[PDB]
């Protein structure tokens, strides 16, 4: 593909001091800003019940698999026009590598 | 995304007249001429274990989403240069529509 895995342990902690502020991703666990992850592999954007989506998330109807996933994480915002996450962006691939190992990984 | 739910009844006799001839779908299936494809969703290229894939296939690490599979569907030999299957392609995106609606709930 275009993504090729990394670490695990190296993407536990970026979740932590990248992600964890605004969202869960244990099953069971609650949205916050962010919805709660667990199980985001293979869903499409914007289904997770009980939460708020803006409008742009809902109508780019996303299959989340690891290689979208990576494009999203460099600029959310260009990705989805109008997406209210407020982060700017995972530049190097090998950070994405890492985190989305991680997620692949919890999110199960 | 940029593919639409159809008819898994549609894609049920799609299966049967179009791919049925190599493969099986159903979980505790056997590889024919080609591999079995129950849990095929999520999965990278070349990966079914037991069956002799070509080089180009493994190669290629395609992830399995609902999208690849359909640009796979249209023309499998442009998609995977070298590939061994012998199948010229389904045409029309409803075909398609309907078949991965059939797929995804069979290989699950
Ligand atoms: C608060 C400052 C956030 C941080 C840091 C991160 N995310 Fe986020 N995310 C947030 C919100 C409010 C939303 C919903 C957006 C909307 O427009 O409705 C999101 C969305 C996501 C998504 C899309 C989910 C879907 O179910 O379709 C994903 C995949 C996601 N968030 C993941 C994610 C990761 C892995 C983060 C660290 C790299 C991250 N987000 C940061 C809020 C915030
Ligand atoms: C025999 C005439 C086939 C027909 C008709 C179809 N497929 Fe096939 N397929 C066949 C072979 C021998 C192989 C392996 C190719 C190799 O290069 O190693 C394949 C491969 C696939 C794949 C890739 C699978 C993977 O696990 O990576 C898929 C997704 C697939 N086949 C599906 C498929 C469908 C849905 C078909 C009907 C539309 C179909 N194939 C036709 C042999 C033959």
């Known amino acids: 593909?275009?993504?090729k895995a990394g670490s695990?342990?190296?993407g536990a902690t970026?979740?932590?001091t990248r992600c964890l502020q605004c969202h869960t991703v244990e099953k069971?666990?609650?949205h916050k800003v962010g919805?709660?992850?667990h199980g985001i592999f293979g869903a499409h954007s914007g289904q997770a019940?009980?939460?708020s989506y803006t409008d742009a998330n809902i109508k780019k109807n996303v299959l989340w698999d690891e290689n979208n996933m990576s494009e999203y994480l460099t600029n959310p915002k260009?990705?989805?026009p109008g997406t209210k996450m407020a982060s700017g962006g995972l530049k190097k691939?090998?950070?994405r590598n890492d985190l989305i190992t991680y997620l692949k990984k919890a999110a199960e």
């Open 14 to 16: 970026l979740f932590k």
């Open 28 to 30: 069971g666990g609650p």
């Open 1 to 3: 593909t275009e993504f």
């Open 93 to 95: 691939e090998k950070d």
């Open 49 to 51: 019940e009980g939460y």
């Open 78 to 80: 260009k990705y989805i």
């Open 8 to 10: 695990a342990k190296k």
């Open 35 to 37: 919805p709660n992850l």
